[PDB]
Enzyme design. Structure first.
Site, short mmCIF file in Angstrom:
data_model
loop_
_atom_site.label_atom_id
_atom_site.label_comp_id
_atom_site.label_asym_id
_atom_site.label_seq_id
_atom_site.Cartn_x
_atom_site.Cartn_y
_atom_site.Cartn_z
N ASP B 99 0.85 -1.20 0.00
CA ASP B 99 0.00 0.00 0.00
C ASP B 99 0.88 1.25 0.00
O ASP B 99 1.79 1.33 -0.81
CB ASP B 99 -0.97 -0.18 1.17
CG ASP B 99 -2.11 0.85 1.29
OD1 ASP B 99 -1.87 1.96 1.86
OD2 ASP B 99 -3.23 0.51 0.87
N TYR B 207 -2.85 11.42 1.67
CA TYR B 207 -3.70 11.57 0.48
C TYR B 207 -3.81 13.03 0.05
O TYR B 207 -3.86 13.36 -1.16
CB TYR B 207 -5.09 11.06 0.85
CG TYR B 207 -5.10 9.58 1.14
CD1 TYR B 207 -4.82 9.06 2.38
CD2 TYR B 207 -5.34 8.67 0.08
CE1 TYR B 207 -4.84 7.69 2.62
CE2 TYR B 207 -5.31 7.30 0.31
CZ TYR B 207 -5.03 6.81 1.57
OH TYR B 207 -5.05 5.46 1.82
N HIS B 268 -6.59 -6.88 -1.35
CA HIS B 268 -5.57 -5.90 -1.05
C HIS B 268 -4.66 -6.39 0.07
O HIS B 268 -3.47 -6.11 0.02
CB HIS B 268 -6.29 -4.56 -0.72
CG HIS B 268 -5.37 -3.40 -0.62
ND1 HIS B 268 -4.62 -2.95 -1.69
CD2 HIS B 268 -4.98 -2.67 0.44
CE1 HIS B 268 -3.84 -1.95 -1.30
NE2 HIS B 268 -4.07 -1.75 -0.03
O1 LIG Z 1 -4.98 3.74 -0.40
C1 LIG Z 1 -3.60 3.73 -1.01
C2 LIG Z 1 -3.20 4.92 -1.89
C3 LIG Z 1 -4.13 4.99 -3.16
C4 LIG Z 1 -3.94 3.72 -4.02
C5 LIG Z 1 -4.38 2.56 -3.14
C6 LIG Z 1 -3.60 2.42 -1.83
CL1 LIG Z 1 -1.85 2.01 -2.14
#
Ligand SMILES: Oc1ccccc1Cl
Ligand SMILES: Oc1ccccc1Cl
Ligand SMILES: [Cl-]
Ligand SMILES: [Cl-]
Lengths: 298, 288
Positions: B99, B207, B268
Site C-alpha cells: 500500500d 492523500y 488488497h
Molecule cells: O490507499 C492507497 C493509496 C491509493 C492507491 C491505493 C492504496 Cl496504495
C-alpha cells in the site's frame, strides 16, 4: 402551429429561463447535471403535439439566475423554484418529469407538495431517501459516487472541469453513454456554450456541496420523507455508471399510489438520449391513461 | 532473541520500529490504515533468516506526527526510510512495501537504487502509473472514491473515528476476501493504534499531500527514473482499492529483472489472506 419559444419569468427570488412548445396539460421536463433544457431536444417537439411542454434551466444553469453561496442550492429551495414556476406559468398543477438532479427535485416536490403535481415521471434519479439511507452501506454506490466526493472541494473542481474546453465534462458524458457518437461535435459546442456562462459550473457543483456533502451521506440521523401519493412512472436505463442497482431495490416501497417501472436494460444514465422515441411513448401513454375505468372492453 | 521495540531519530523525526533476527537488513513497510502489526504473520518467520525491521511510518502509531499537510509529501516519506537504513547502521536494505509503504518503496528505489538491494511490492501501484493512468480509468477513479473523500478537512476524521472507529473497521472488513479475518483481539490492537493522538489526521494527510485532484488530473509529465534493482510484485487480484489497469505494462518503469506473482483469490491485504505463501515468495526471492 406552435413553435418552440424561449421565455423568462421571475420565480422564488430568481429569474428562470425556459423553452416551451405546444398547448394543453402543463408538462415540465427537468434536467440534471451537467445538462440544461437542451437535454430534452428529442422529446420536446413530439410531446408538444399533445401537451404544453415546459423545459426550464434550473437554478444555477445556462440562462437562469445564479445566486452565490452553497446554501442557496439546498433541495428545499430548488423544489420551491419549481412550485414557483408552475404558478408563474399560470397553472396550479403539472405533470413533472425529472432526470438526474431534476428527478431528485421532482421526488422532493412531489412528496412535500403533492397538490402541485398531477403525475410524476422519474428517469434515472434515485429517491433521495434511498440515496441518503443506502449509500453509506453500498461499496458499489460509494465507488460510483467518487465524483460527488471530488466536487466537495472548493475552487479546484471548477478549474479541473473547465480546462481544455471542458474536456473533463465532455468525458463524463461520453463515458456514460452505451452508444458511440451519441453526441455530435455540434452538440458538444452547444453544451460548452452553456457551461461557459459565468458562474454556471460553480452553481451546478453547489448542488452536491449543499445536499450530498459527507456529513449528509454518513449522517446518523434518518431522513424524513413523506410517501409519494400521486401516480408515478420510473424509467430506468440499467447500465447507469452513476447509480448502483442497490439504490433502486424495492423503490416501489416509497410510493403509496399507482406505480410503474420500465427498465431499459441496454441503456445508461441518459436514457432519454439513447431510446428517445420509446421514452416519449412511455411518458405519453402514462399521462393520457384515464384514471377512471368504467367501460371495460368498449 | 524475540521481537523488540526500538526508537531512532531520522530525517528530523523519531521513528518507532520493531525488530527480530540477525543478518541482511529486511524492511517491511505498512500502508493505510495499518502499522507495524500488519506484518505480524511474517516477522517471526522471516526473522529466522534475516534482520527484520518493521517501522511505523511518519504519522502512524508510535512514530512522530508532524503537523501540516506539506510534511507528508512523498519525497519526505522516502527520505525518512533512507534515514532509517542509515540510523540502523546500514547502507542498503531489502525493502518490502504494502500500500503506501509500497508507494514509498517504489519512490525510494527509483531515486536511491544504491540503498536498495532488492524491492518487493505488495498491492501498491507505481506512483507514476497512478498519476498517469488514474484520470483515464473510470474503474480506478471509482475505486479511489475515498481518496477524494479524504481531501476535505476535519469531516473525514470525524466520520472515520465515530463509534469506536466503526467506519475504518468497516473499510477493512469489506476489503477482505474472507469473513472474520480480524479477531476481537486484533481489532482492539488496531483501535489502540488509531486512537494515538494525531494518528488519523496524519494518515489522511498522505492523500491530501500526494493524491489531491490537482495532482491526479495534472497534464504534466511526471519525472520518475526507471527501477534498476531486481523487483518482485505480489498482487492480490480482488483488490477493492486498485484496478488491474494500474499494474499492467510495467516495462516502461523497470530496467531490471522483474517478476509478478498474482494471487487470484486474495484481495488488497494479501499478506493477511495467504501469510505463508506471501512469506515463501519473499524468502525465495531474497535468497535465490
Ligand atoms: O490507499 C492507497 C493509496 C491509493 C492507491 C491505493 C492504496 Cl496504495
Ligand atoms: O449526480 C447526480 C446526483 C448523484 C446521484 C446520480 C445523479 Cl442523480
Ligand atoms: Cl423565442
Ligand atoms: Cl434497452
Amino acid at each position: 402551429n406552435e413553435m418552440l419559444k424561449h421565455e423568462y419569468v421571475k420565480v422564488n427570488g430568481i429569474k428562470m429561463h425556459y423553452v416551451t412548445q405546444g398547448k394543453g396539460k402543463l408538462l415540465l421536463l427537468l434536467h440534471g447535471f451537467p445538462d440544461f433544457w437542451y437535454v430534452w431536444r428529442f422529446q420536446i417537439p413530439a410531446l408538444a403535439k399533445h401537451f404544453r411542454v415546459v423545459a426550464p434551466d434550473l437554478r444555477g444553469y445556462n440562462e437562469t439566475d445564479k445566486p452565490e453561496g452553497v446554501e442557496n442550492y439546498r433541495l428545499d429551495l430548488l423544489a420551491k423554484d419549481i412550485l414557483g414556476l408552475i404558478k408563474a406559468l399560470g397553472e396550479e398543477h403539472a405533470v413533472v418529469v425529472g432526470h438526474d438532479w431534476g428527478g431528485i427535485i421532482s421526488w422532493t416536490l412531489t412528496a412535500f407538495n403533492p397538490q402541485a403535481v398531477e403525475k410524476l415521471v422519474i428517469l434515472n434519479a434515485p429517491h433521495p431517501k434511498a440515496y441518503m439511507t443506502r449509500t453509506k452501506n453500498s461499496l458499489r454506490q460509494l465507488q460510483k459516487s467518487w465524483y460527488v466526493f471530488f466536487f466537495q472541494v472548493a475552487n479546484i473542481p471548477e478549474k479541473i472541469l473547465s480546462r481544455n474546453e471542458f474536456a473533463f465534462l465532455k468525458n463524463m458524458l461520453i463515458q456514460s453513454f452505451v452508444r458511440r457518437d451519441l453526441l455530435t461535435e455540434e452538440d458538444l459546442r452547444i453544451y460548452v456554450d452553456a457551461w461557459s456562462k459565468s458562474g454556471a459550473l460553480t452553481s451546478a457543483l453547489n448542488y452536491y456541496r449543499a445536499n450530498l456533502n459527507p456529513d449528509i451521506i454518513f449522517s446518523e440521523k434518518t431522513v424524513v420523507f413523506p410517501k409519494i401519493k400521486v401516480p408515478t412512472l420510473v424509467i430506468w436505463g440499467e447500465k447507469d455508471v452513476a447509480i448502483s442497482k442497490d439504490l433502486i431495490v424495492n423503490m416501489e416501497d416509497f410510493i403509496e399510489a399507482p406505480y410503474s417501472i420500465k427498465y431499459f436494460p441496454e441503456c445508461g444514465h441518459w436514457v432519454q438520449l439513447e431510446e428517445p422515441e420509446l421514452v416519449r411513448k412511455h411518458i405519453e401513454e402514462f399521462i393520457l391513461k384515464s384514471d377512471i375505468h368504467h367501460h371495460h372492453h368498449h
